[PDB]
mmCIF file of all heavy atoms in Angstrom:
data_model
loop_
_atom_site.group_PDB
_atom_site.id
_atom_site.type_symbol
_atom_site.label_atom_id
_atom_site.label_comp_id
_atom_site.label_asym_id
_atom_site.label_seq_id
_atom_site.Cartn_x
_atom_site.Cartn_y
_atom_site.Cartn_z
ATOM 1 N N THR A 42 79.557 50.192 38.561
ATOM 2 C CA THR A 42 79.080 49.009 37.865
ATOM 3 C C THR A 42 77.578 48.854 38.089
ATOM 4 O O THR A 42 76.995 49.449 38.998
ATOM 5 C CB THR A 42 79.824 47.755 38.332
ATOM 6 O OG1 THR A 42 79.643 47.599 39.743
ATOM 7 C CG2 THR A 42 81.316 47.853 38.008
ATOM 8 N N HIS A 43 76.954 48.043 37.241
ATOM 9 C CA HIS A 43 75.501 47.956 37.154
ATOM 10 C C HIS A 43 75.123 46.488 37.186
ATOM 11 O O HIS A 43 75.644 45.699 36.395
ATOM 12 C CB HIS A 43 75.011 48.631 35.853
ATOM 13 C CG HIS A 43 73.523 48.668 35.687
ATOM 14 N ND1 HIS A 43 72.813 47.643 35.095
ATOM 15 C CD2 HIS A 43 72.619 49.632 35.976
ATOM 16 C CE1 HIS A 43 71.532 47.962 35.058
ATOM 17 N NE2 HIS A 43 71.388 49.167 35.584
ATOM 18 N N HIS A 44 74.237 46.116 38.111
ATOM 19 C CA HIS A 44 73.896 44.715 38.341
ATOM 20 C C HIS A 44 72.385 44.585 38.487
ATOM 21 O O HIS A 44 71.827 44.888 39.558
ATOM 22 C CB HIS A 44 74.611 44.175 39.577
ATOM 23 C CG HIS A 44 76.062 44.547 39.642
ATOM 24 N ND1 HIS A 44 77.051 43.781 39.070
ATOM 25 C CD2 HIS A 44 76.691 45.597 40.225
ATOM 26 C CE1 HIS A 44 78.228 44.346 39.284
ATOM 27 N NE2 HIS A 44 78.037 45.446 39.990
ATOM 28 N N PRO A 45 71.697 44.122 37.444
ATOM 29 C CA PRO A 45 70.241 43.956 37.522
ATOM 30 C C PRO A 45 69.828 43.054 38.677
ATOM 31 O O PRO A 45 70.416 41.997 38.913
ATOM 32 C CB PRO A 45 69.886 43.339 36.163
ATOM 33 C CG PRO A 45 70.954 43.828 35.249
ATOM 34 C CD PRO A 45 72.212 43.865 36.086
ATOM 35 N N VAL A 46 68.816 43.501 39.414
ATOM 36 C CA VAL A 46 68.264 42.742 40.531
ATOM 37 C C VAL A 46 66.927 42.099 40.166
ATOM 38 O O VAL A 46 66.566 41.060 40.740
ATOM 39 C CB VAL A 46 68.135 43.672 41.757
ATOM 40 C CG1 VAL A 46 67.140 43.154 42.765
ATOM 41 C CG2 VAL A 46 69.513 43.855 42.395
ATOM 42 N N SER A 47 66.211 42.655 39.204
ATOM 43 C CA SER A 47 64.950 42.100 38.735
ATOM 44 C C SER A 47 64.651 42.737 37.388
ATOM 45 O O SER A 47 65.468 43.489 36.842
ATOM 46 C CB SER A 47 63.824 42.360 39.740
ATOM 47 O OG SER A 47 63.476 43.735 39.733
ATOM 48 N N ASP A 48 63.457 42.466 36.868
ATOM 49 C CA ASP A 48 63.037 43.082 35.623
ATOM 50 C C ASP A 48 62.759 44.567 35.775
ATOM 51 O O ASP A 48 62.562 45.241 34.763
ATOM 52 C CB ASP A 48 61.799 42.362 35.068
ATOM 53 C CG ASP A 48 60.615 42.411 36.016
ATOM 54 O OD1 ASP A 48 60.812 42.659 37.221
ATOM 55 O OD2 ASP A 48 59.480 42.181 35.551
ATOM 56 N N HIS A 49 62.747 45.111 36.994
ATOM 57 C CA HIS A 49 62.530 46.545 37.120
ATOM 58 C C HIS A 49 63.470 47.255 38.087
ATOM 59 O O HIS A 49 63.322 48.470 38.266
ATOM 60 C CB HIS A 49 61.077 46.837 37.530
ATOM 61 C CG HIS A 49 60.759 46.441 38.934
ATOM 62 N ND1 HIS A 49 60.593 45.126 39.315
ATOM 63 C CD2 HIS A 49 60.574 47.184 40.049
ATOM 64 C CE1 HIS A 49 60.314 45.078 40.604
ATOM 65 N NE2 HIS A 49 60.302 46.313 41.074
ATOM 66 N N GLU A 50 64.449 46.563 38.680
ATOM 67 C CA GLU A 50 65.405 47.214 39.572
ATOM 68 C C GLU A 50 66.822 46.716 39.312
ATOM 69 O O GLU A 50 67.040 45.629 38.769
ATOM 70 C CB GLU A 50 65.048 46.993 41.042
ATOM 71 C CG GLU A 50 63.779 47.700 41.454
ATOM 72 C CD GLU A 50 63.208 47.130 42.735
ATOM 73 O OE1 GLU A 50 63.217 45.889 42.876
ATOM 74 O OE2 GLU A 50 62.755 47.914 43.586
ATOM 75 N N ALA A 51 67.792 47.535 39.718
ATOM 76 C CA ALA A 51 69.193 47.199 39.511
ATOM 77 C C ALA A 51 70.047 47.828 40.604
ATOM 78 O O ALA A 51 69.693 48.865 41.175
ATOM 79 C CB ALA A 51 69.668 47.659 38.137
ATOM 80 N N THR A 52 71.188 47.200 40.877
ATOM 81 C CA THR A 52 72.146 47.718 41.844
ATOM 82 C C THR A 52 73.240 48.479 41.113
ATOM 83 O O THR A 52 73.884 47.927 40.216
ATOM 84 C CB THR A 52 72.785 46.600 42.659
ATOM 85 O OG1 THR A 52 71.772 45.908 43.392
ATOM 86 C CG2 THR A 52 73.810 47.197 43.617
ATOM 87 N N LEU A 53 73.447 49.734 41.506
ATOM 88 C CA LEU A 53 74.616 50.519 41.124
ATOM 89 C C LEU A 53 75.646 50.413 42.231
ATOM 90 O O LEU A 53 75.333 50.698 43.391
ATOM 91 C CB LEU A 53 74.250 51.987 40.922
ATOM 92 C CG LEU A 53 73.157 52.257 39.891
ATOM 93 C CD1 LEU A 53 72.875 53.738 39.857
ATOM 94 C CD2 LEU A 53 73.607 51.736 38.530
ATOM 95 N N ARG A 54 76.861 49.993 41.890
ATOM 96 C CA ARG A 54 77.922 49.871 42.879
ATOM 97 C C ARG A 54 79.053 50.813 42.493
ATOM 98 O O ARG A 54 79.612 50.706 41.393
ATOM 99 C CB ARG A 54 78.422 48.429 42.997
ATOM 100 C CG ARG A 54 79.566 48.263 44.032
ATOM 101 C CD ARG A 54 79.801 46.799 44.422
ATOM 102 N NE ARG A 54 78.687 46.260 45.202
ATOM 103 C CZ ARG A 54 77.804 45.370 44.748
ATOM 104 N NH1 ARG A 54 77.927 44.879 43.524
ATOM 105 N NH2 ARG A 54 76.812 44.954 45.534
ATOM 106 N N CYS A 55 79.375 51.731 43.393
ATOM 107 C CA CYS A 55 80.399 52.740 43.169
ATOM 108 C C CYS A 55 81.682 52.307 43.858
ATOM 109 O O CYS A 55 81.695 52.088 45.074
ATOM 110 C CB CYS A 55 79.934 54.088 43.703
ATOM 111 S SG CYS A 55 81.119 55.425 43.507
ATOM 112 N N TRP A 56 82.760 52.214 43.089
ATOM 113 C CA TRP A 56 84.028 51.679 43.553
ATOM 114 C C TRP A 56 85.065 52.779 43.711
ATOM 115 O O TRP A 56 85.191 53.652 42.842
ATOM 116 C CB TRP A 56 84.573 50.661 42.562
ATOM 117 C CG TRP A 56 83.734 49.458 42.367
ATOM 118 C CD1 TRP A 56 82.632 49.335 41.560
ATOM 119 C CD2 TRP A 56 83.945 48.179 42.959
ATOM 120 N NE1 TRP A 56 82.139 48.050 41.633
ATOM 121 C CE2 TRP A 56 82.933 47.322 42.482
ATOM 122 C CE3 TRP A 56 84.896 47.672 43.849
ATOM 123 C CZ2 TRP A 56 82.850 45.988 42.866
ATOM 124 C CZ3 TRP A 56 84.804 46.352 44.234
ATOM 125 C CH2 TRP A 56 83.791 45.526 43.741
ATOM 126 N N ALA A 57 85.830 52.704 44.803
ATOM 127 C CA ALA A 57 87.051 53.481 44.982
ATOM 128 C C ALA A 57 88.175 52.507 45.301
ATOM 129 O O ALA A 57 88.111 51.795 46.310
ATOM 130 C CB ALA A 57 86.896 54.526 46.089
ATOM 131 N N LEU A 58 89.196 52.457 44.438
ATOM 132 C CA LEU A 58 90.226 51.430 44.524
ATOM 133 C C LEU A 58 91.617 52.050 44.478
ATOM 134 O O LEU A 58 91.832 53.040 43.780
ATOM 135 C CB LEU A 58 90.088 50.426 43.376
ATOM 136 C CG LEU A 58 88.804 49.588 43.307
ATOM 137 C CD1 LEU A 58 88.741 48.836 41.965
ATOM 138 C CD2 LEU A 58 88.784 48.617 44.466
ATOM 139 N N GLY A 59 92.547 51.447 45.222
ATOM 140 C CA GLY A 59 93.958 51.787 45.174
ATOM 141 C C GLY A 59 94.341 53.111 45.800
ATOM 142 O O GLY A 59 95.344 53.710 45.387
ATOM 143 N N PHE A 60 93.595 53.578 46.802
ATOM 144 C CA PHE A 60 93.848 54.903 47.341
ATOM 145 C C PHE A 60 94.668 54.829 48.623
ATOM 146 O O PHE A 60 94.687 53.820 49.333
ATOM 147 C CB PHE A 60 92.545 55.687 47.577
ATOM 148 C CG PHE A 60 91.511 54.978 48.434
ATOM 149 C CD1 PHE A 60 91.512 55.125 49.814
ATOM 150 C CD2 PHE A 60 90.485 54.233 47.842
ATOM 151 C CE1 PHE A 60 90.536 54.506 50.606
ATOM 152 C CE2 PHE A 60 89.505 53.610 48.621
ATOM 153 C CZ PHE A 60 89.527 53.754 50.008
ATOM 154 N N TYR A 61 95.379 55.917 48.886
ATOM 155 C CA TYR A 61 96.179 56.072 50.092
ATOM 156 C C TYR A 61 96.278 57.575 50.350
ATOM 157 O O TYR A 61 96.614 58.331 49.430
ATOM 158 C CB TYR A 61 97.571 55.433 49.935
ATOM 159 C CG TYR A 61 98.408 55.576 51.187
ATOM 160 C CD1 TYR A 61 98.394 54.589 52.174
ATOM 161 C CD2 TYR A 61 99.175 56.723 51.408
ATOM 162 C CE1 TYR A 61 99.138 54.735 53.340
ATOM 163 C CE2 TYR A 61 99.920 56.881 52.579
ATOM 164 C CZ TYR A 61 99.905 55.887 53.533
ATOM 165 O OH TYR A 61 100.642 56.039 54.695
ATOM 166 N N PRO A 62 96.020 58.021 51.595
ATOM 167 C CA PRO A 62 95.796 57.234 52.812
ATOM 168 C C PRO A 62 94.379 56.662 52.883
ATOM 169 O O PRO A 62 93.628 56.792 51.917
ATOM 170 C CB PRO A 62 96.042 58.253 53.943
ATOM 171 C CG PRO A 62 95.651 59.556 53.356
ATOM 172 C CD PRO A 62 95.952 59.474 51.863
ATOM 173 N N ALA A 63 94.030 56.062 54.029
ATOM 174 C CA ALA A 63 92.793 55.292 54.120
ATOM 175 C C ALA A 63 91.558 56.180 54.180
ATOM 176 O O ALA A 63 90.474 55.759 53.748
ATOM 177 C CB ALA A 63 92.839 54.377 55.347
ATOM 178 N N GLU A 64 91.690 57.386 54.729
ATOM 179 C CA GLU A 64 90.536 58.254 54.922
ATOM 180 C C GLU A 64 89.863 58.565 53.590
ATOM 181 O O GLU A 64 90.498 59.073 52.661
ATOM 182 C CB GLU A 64 90.948 59.559 55.614
ATOM 183 C CG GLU A 64 89.758 60.377 56.054
ATOM 184 C CD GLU A 64 90.136 61.772 56.491
ATOM 185 O OE1 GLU A 64 91.347 62.056 56.592
ATOM 186 O OE2 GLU A 64 89.223 62.586 56.737
ATOM 187 N N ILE A 65 88.566 58.279 53.508
ATOM 188 C CA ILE A 65 87.820 58.546 52.287
ATOM 189 C C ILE A 65 86.360 58.702 52.667
ATOM 190 O O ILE A 65 85.912 58.171 53.688
ATOM 191 C CB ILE A 65 88.025 57.412 51.249
ATOM 192 C CG1 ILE A 65 87.605 57.885 49.856
ATOM 193 C CG2 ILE A 65 87.231 56.159 51.659
ATOM 194 C CD1 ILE A 65 88.008 56.926 48.746
ATOM 195 N N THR A 66 85.620 59.449 51.855
ATOM 196 C CA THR A 66 84.168 59.447 51.943
ATOM 197 C C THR A 66 83.589 59.038 50.592
ATOM 198 O O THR A 66 84.105 59.428 49.539
ATOM 199 C CB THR A 66 83.618 60.811 52.388
ATOM 200 O OG1 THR A 66 83.830 61.778 51.357
ATOM 201 C CG2 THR A 66 84.319 61.284 53.656
ATOM 202 N N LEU A 67 82.528 58.229 50.632
ATOM 203 C CA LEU A 67 81.872 57.736 49.423
ATOM 204 C C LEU A 67 80.390 57.622 49.744
ATOM 205 O O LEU A 67 80.011 56.854 50.628
ATOM 206 C CB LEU A 67 82.449 56.380 48.992
ATOM 207 C CG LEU A 67 82.044 55.666 47.687
ATOM 208 C CD1 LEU A 67 83.002 54.503 47.462
ATOM 209 C CD2 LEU A 67 80.619 55.139 47.701
ATOM 210 N N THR A 68 79.561 58.398 49.053
ATOM 211 C CA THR A 68 78.134 58.421 49.322
ATOM 212 C C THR A 68 77.379 58.449 48.004
ATOM 213 O O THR A 68 77.938 58.764 46.951
ATOM 214 C CB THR A 68 77.720 59.636 50.166
ATOM 215 O OG1 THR A 68 77.974 60.830 49.419
ATOM 216 C CG2 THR A 68 78.491 59.684 51.511
ATOM 217 N N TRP A 69 76.095 58.120 48.081
ATOM 218 C CA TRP A 69 75.191 58.173 46.945
ATOM 219 C C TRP A 69 74.172 59.285 47.141
ATOM 220 O O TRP A 69 73.738 59.566 48.262
ATOM 221 C CB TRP A 69 74.451 56.843 46.761
ATOM 222 C CG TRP A 69 75.210 55.796 45.984
ATOM 223 C CD1 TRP A 69 75.818 54.677 46.486
ATOM 224 C CD2 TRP A 69 75.409 55.757 44.567
ATOM 225 N NE1 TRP A 69 76.390 53.951 45.466
ATOM 226 C CE2 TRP A 69 76.147 54.588 44.279
ATOM 227 C CE3 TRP A 69 75.017 56.587 43.508
ATOM 228 C CZ2 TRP A 69 76.506 54.233 42.980
ATOM 229 C CZ3 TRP A 69 75.377 56.241 42.227
ATOM 230 C CH2 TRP A 69 76.124 55.077 41.970
ATOM 231 N N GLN A 70 73.783 59.907 46.034
ATOM 232 C CA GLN A 70 72.711 60.889 46.026
ATOM 233 C C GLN A 70 71.713 60.538 44.933
ATOM 234 O O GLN A 70 72.075 59.982 43.896
ATOM 235 C CB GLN A 70 73.242 62.322 45.805
ATOM 236 C CG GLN A 70 74.034 62.877 46.977
ATOM 237 C CD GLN A 70 74.552 64.287 46.730
ATOM 238 O OE1 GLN A 70 73.922 65.090 46.039
ATOM 239 N NE2 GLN A 70 75.710 64.590 47.295
#
């Protein structure tokens, strides 16, 4: 998802939902 923070920046939020088992890795590049 994409959430503007100002007129020149924004937050990208990466979601992982409904997974099992709990072990997961989630990173940004």
Side-chain angles (χ1 to χ4, degrees):
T42 58
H43 183 272
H44 315 271
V46 159
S47 71
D48 60 341
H49 70 286
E50 292 162 318
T52 299
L53 303 178
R54 179 165 291 108
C55 179
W56 297 82
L58 297 170
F60 54 89
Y61 181 91
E64 190 191 352
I65 197 170
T66 69
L67 185 169
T68 64
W69 276 106
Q70 290 180 32

